[PDB]
Symmetry: D2
Subunit: 470 residues, 4 copies
């Protein structure tokens, strides 16, 4: 298990090929746009060494101690242990961090347990997993193919340029990678692959510092460094990037899938990576929802709005959604079964329910906070104003029905950062699409779900109807 | 365990004091308005004697065999057994029957296990439970107080007129009782009781044939007897009634609570009746949702609408809601704990989530069926037309893209009966309010839920914000 | 202008070829399933002769008096006059009647004014209009093609079998025709026509008594004849029918379009029939919405629920929707322009807005009534119970906070009939689809609407963005 | 009519008492947080002198030329002229500017026309209007009272400390004032006044530079100065402020209402200010909606998503909302009537409909843009990246199905700034609450709306129901 210092040191030593507004970022650990998330990720690693949480966040094996997200679960109890670790880590940042390492570690763990799926590349997969686990490295993954203005370069989407004796050379780009402050980047199956697209049907991993690999940043959403003024954006801004592959060399040892269309398309499901990564997500969203509930309750109480029935109802609505997610989480673990490779995977029915329902619930939970805070959310002064000449006046005029001025503004700055700041609004779009387009996700659910039992019950029930004709 | 014949015989022998449009119903077992539901309830009892389901629907004890809904659960396994019985019974009528006996048997079972709660009336409670169980009787319950035109009779709502040595005399009325074709009626806590309302703070049970007890029916919703034309209303029309108490004598042995305001208000929660009855409901709604899923899938497939993405999405939405309910059900049982009286009760958090979410989901599930069936839902001929002179033309013009005419119409008559018939529309209102007004239910959830943990996590998170001032 | 008696006499003399449950209906004017709507339609005709409304419902021309829905409007004032007549008629039945004659008279009026559109069949169109107007006949129209079980008859959808010197012979069927108690039936463009489908590309009209023409009824939704028990279904049940064409002879004089695909597809828009029929609809829905507002307000007041803020809000929501519809109606008339044939047509932008918004508003308006009435909506006794032995008890227990028992139940029976009765629920499905499938309607709006001005404003605004590169 | 230069000069000469993060802003015309909006407001004034728009934005009177928002309308045509000016100005900034001067000029114009309402202060009102008009000054208004931590200063909300011979001295604060870069600030009726609150029942106006008057800023939402990167926040960030009154002297000539509770509460409605300000809003929201429609259409087309039916439907939905607003606008003007003071005011029914419907429509319109742009909205590089070393790669990988890279990103940066940037998200909260809390707004609509006509129609309809008893 790695410490925060080791993580920071590694990033400083071999920084990702990050670009911010046309310029290379030489040291993300100190750059104003990235130092916040770097310190936050480091704290997650440090927590693994806190005596209070050591047993929750790590497990001992043959003299070594590894992060819980690497644990290949053999029993439901193990599954529960993985869940508690997902939850503890998520709670540190109120469920705002969407690409913490444990999400992808769950994917690689599943890939490794189901390694046979990869055929000749099986050993590569098992060894990559051992590497990530032993070094306790942080990963990120690049998704989505770009479009081409059709109003003939074969390397727009990431593709194999040539295969040598040392590996493959890839060229192209992935539209987005969240949290590039990782040691590694996964280029796994993303956009559905059509027949004949073997040149793009590949899966591999690379150090984020690889020559020819470029991460181009979007506008920074860090509001500032003050925790009072920007309680969340000052520390949990993960960043999103365009990922460019300029004739990047991928060593054979890092190739997991090569030129196999169907293998790529079925990878996540077959290996159980889908199940485990969705397991991390449901625990993460439960944490996120608990945070919104807490803020909503404190806001209502703080301004005396809790006496209003409709406010009580909005808060109760959040409680209902929280219980829904907890329920999906419980059933996912309790109904877990082993897959074709012997890997115990949490129930897909329950996890599909959670990841397809939350994208609809989140915008409403966000709306609820907006409706409770109302106009009190857009005219919040800075800590600098409290510290300034007018400080006395602010303490006299910014009080809440049950809160002093500094307390009220601090709480409202948080509610604001959770919803209306650039950071807060991004969280909304992210929840709506992080697992994919709801339109495609729902069509996928429709096709995979076994509807036969319900259809049969109705046909049986209809026998009596058709009998009137005999 | 009772058989259907015994149930039918008992109703015929001592019929409830039913009134339909100003006239007394002498024999509900043969009356066109009630014979359908009577036969349906009888079939539920007969199922307990089917070798295939005997072990699911009943349990053996000291030489006797009782219905599973009477089982006082000692373990989570017992809880699961009660759930499977709730489900099996619910599936017989596609979850359309809202007041099947097992719902209230769960209440009485809980009252009996937590009998001490009732003090001096404890023995009365235990004996009533043994009576219901041993005789395997069906119960119904009367709810809601009437209003008074304020634009001084003390007996509008049910109240104690006088207490004698043989019992109490009550006068007043309850606005509604669903499924009056029961052997017994429960007059338990309903409208919240205010201080000083001791005269109305009582709980008791009576045979539905009691002198002075009257059940006044609302418009009948039985569309007819044909299963082809009215697949559901011809058999699952439970009926709703105004319940009048004309100086009704309640024997002391049937009194469970007398003149105690707070006892009445906390009865359901304290005894665990709330938990167990909500347990029956969540399994019931899971069954109901599975039925809608089956009909929606068959409809889409039957008319070839399943090729459309948006239709696939609507069906997937039902799947998501189905999984949500299954999840609440699983967590309710897995998180069960014993209450203050040693009775194991399923988790309230999960059950409150389910019963407060479903009233919002049901109207949407109903809407989805309407959107898939569309105009094909309102111009459905009768089986009589297929049997008539134009039969040949109907078989040529009422086909579906993948269904013959009789099959399509039969399926659509069902979808119609499940949504747009008077029977189908009532089901919607019923789902919206059967457990109570959502406005009050949500306010109740807000007040009972422990929000402290989430509030504390936020206060802790805000410590860093207020620190900028030190 | 016709009287109700003349309408009744004509129907009795030459009744439509109606079939109800395998049997022919010999006299709809007295049949329990149809006498209600017949009397209601007759009253609409009689109203044209009431001195108070004569000037609103009719106009004088060359010694004759015609129904206002036949008036070819030359000015905006004329348009307003047509609207007031639509409204007055709609108000008679609280906007519940969806196929009153004026709807289709607006279509034929537009067809006639734009007669040149029909080429060689132009005169036929003008003469048919004069016939309908002079005789003041009621029309209905048959829509939608049936499906074929693909899991080779060329006459499933209505098609030309053979053309003779006396006319054409058609065979096939239309899935639905609402209000078959009309003198005439229009077989105009419905399902979009594909290239090569000339055999089905035709438009004509026929007397509903034509040999070979059959109207097969769906389940009757008339709850009874009592206005207290069934205030709406006893009088405004229009009925929906499957329409069968068994080698029906269509005289050449009744042919408006023959074998022309594109002519059929553009008929409604080109002639302005779309605009005028939508004009009748917007006034009709305004009337319907005003009725729901009135019932909601009386209900809230009647039970004292009007003191609750959330109830006030739901009613205010209906008010907002009412104002929206009134606004669409006002703009439709104020922005009217003449079409390619010189016919003044109300603004399509506004009418498209109204007919595409109302299908979304109606279900919510219906929901609102359900939420206000709540459980008070499903346990309403009959007038027979008030007249029966228990009458005294009902008058004592069915009062409202501000209403006596008979008044409250009468009002609630209406709210019920407007939402939860089979009649009420059908109204919901009807509003969702009467003009067509919202999915297709929205795609049609997207393609016809001129989006260029808004796109241009944005391109202009973006010039400044692309300038940073120069 | 003022020019932009004159506006800029005045602000520079006598700058508002603005505070940004504990520091006084000496020159807002050059300060990075305010120079954007200052230049934007100046451009609005300059437009009044453009020959193309002179006749739309101004009117000539006795040798002078005034801004159209000052025109006291005598006819519906005048009303239309005011509307066209509101619209033209709104279009300059895609309806994003919520407090452009014409909004409050409409209020003062109405106050002046209805001056008698103010009694002894009538002349003060008329003269203030002439002052604002003649000088063509920009105003802002301060709203909402602060709360007091009740878990005795009489001057928390703005109140009269003492009345002298030169005026009144006020102390207290208003929670928010949008667009403080104005010459004047209005302290008109805001929070509803209770009986006995005469000390707070006052209305007056002051120069924003008044001694003791302080404007404390909230976090700045200006993303930067680049129009490519921040197309809207770089120019339309109006800013919101806490307004502090430290013993501010209000000259008698600037007092409009003093110590009159009911006068304050009925001011906006009685004078017609409500009607006219809402008139500016409906035209403003129509402009805003047209902008979203344009961006949505260009986005769909730009990425080829316009071929998908569901995308076409979302765009059609925006079209429907656009038509709804245009309709409210048309009816508001066409149904205008004179108030008790002879001032022609646009219809309140229609304007109340628009301002109570839009707060519900806007979040959905915003959602629609998010659903179309999807993940393409959160990984948008800067113009600096296109200008940087990787420029060539971006032009190759950031293309749209029908757009080149720079064009696509520019368009998406705008869609982003309109929804997910801090500026964009604030617009959402602002639309939800700018006119007030929807809960209170709906209750206000309920109480003011005349529901009698609809209630009467139903009572009449129910006569037939109660007749069955005679």
């Amino acid at each position: 298990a790695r410490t925060g210092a080791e993580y920071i040191e590694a990033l400083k030593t071999r920084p990702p090929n990050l670009w911010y507004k046309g310029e290379k970022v030489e040291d993300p650990t100190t750059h104003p746009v990235f130092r916040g998330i770097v310190r936050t990720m480091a704290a997650l690693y440090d927590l693994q060494h806190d005596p209070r949480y050591r047993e929750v966040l790590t497990y001992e094996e043959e003299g070594k101690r590894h992060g819980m997200s690497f644990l290949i679960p053999k029993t439901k109890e193990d599954l529960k242990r993985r869940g508690q670790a997902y939850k503890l880590w998520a709670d540190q940042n109120l469920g705002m961090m969407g690409r913490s390492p444990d999400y992808l570690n769950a994917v690689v763990m599943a890939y490794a347990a189901s390694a046979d799926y990869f055929g000749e590349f099986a050993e590569n997969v098992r060894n990559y997993y051992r590497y990530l686990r032993d070094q306790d490295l942080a990963t990120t993954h690049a998704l989505t193919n770009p479009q081409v203005n059709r109003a003939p370069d074969p390397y727009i989407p990431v593709g194999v340029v040539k295969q040598t004796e040392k590996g493959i050379v890839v060229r192209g780009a992935r539209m987005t990678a969240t949290f590039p402050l990782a040691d590694e980047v996964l280029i796994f199956p993303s956009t559905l692959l059509q027949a004949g697209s073997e040149k793009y049907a590949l899966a591999f991993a690379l150090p984020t510092s690889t020559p020819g690999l470029h991460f181009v940043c979007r506008e920074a959403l860090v509001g500032g460094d003050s925790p009072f003024d920007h309680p969340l954006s000052s520390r949990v801004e993960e960043m999103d990037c365009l990922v460019i592959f300029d004739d990047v060399l991928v060593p054979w040892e890092r190739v997991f899938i090569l030129g196999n269309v169907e293998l790529c398309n079925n990878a996540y499901a077959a290996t159980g990576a889908l199940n485990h990564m969705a397991h991390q997500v449901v625990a993460l969203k439960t944490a996120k929802t608990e945070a919104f509930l807490g803020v909503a309750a404190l806001m209502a109480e703080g301004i005396g709005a809790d006496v209003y029935g409709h406010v009580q109802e909005k808060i109760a609505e959040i409680i209902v959604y929280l219980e829904a997610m907890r329920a999906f989480w419980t059933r996912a673990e309790e109904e877990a079964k082993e897959n074709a490779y012997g890997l115990l995977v949490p129930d897909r029915g329950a996890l599909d329910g959670a990841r397809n329902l939350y994208p609809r619930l989140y915008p409403r939970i966000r709306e609820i906070l907006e409706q409770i805070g109302a106009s009190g959310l857009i005219t919040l002064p800075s800590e600098k104003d409290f510290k300034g000449p007018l400080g006395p006046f602010l303490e006299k005029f910014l009080q809440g029905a049950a809160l002093e001025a500094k307390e009220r503004v601090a709480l409202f700055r948080l509610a604001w950062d959770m919803t209306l700041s650039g950071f807060g609004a991004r969280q909304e779009l992210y929840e709506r699409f992080f697992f994919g387009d709801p339109v495609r996700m729902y069509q996928t659910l429709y096709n995979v779900y076994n509807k036969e039992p319900y259809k049969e019950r109705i046909r049986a029930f209809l026998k009596e109807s058709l009998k009137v004709f005999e």
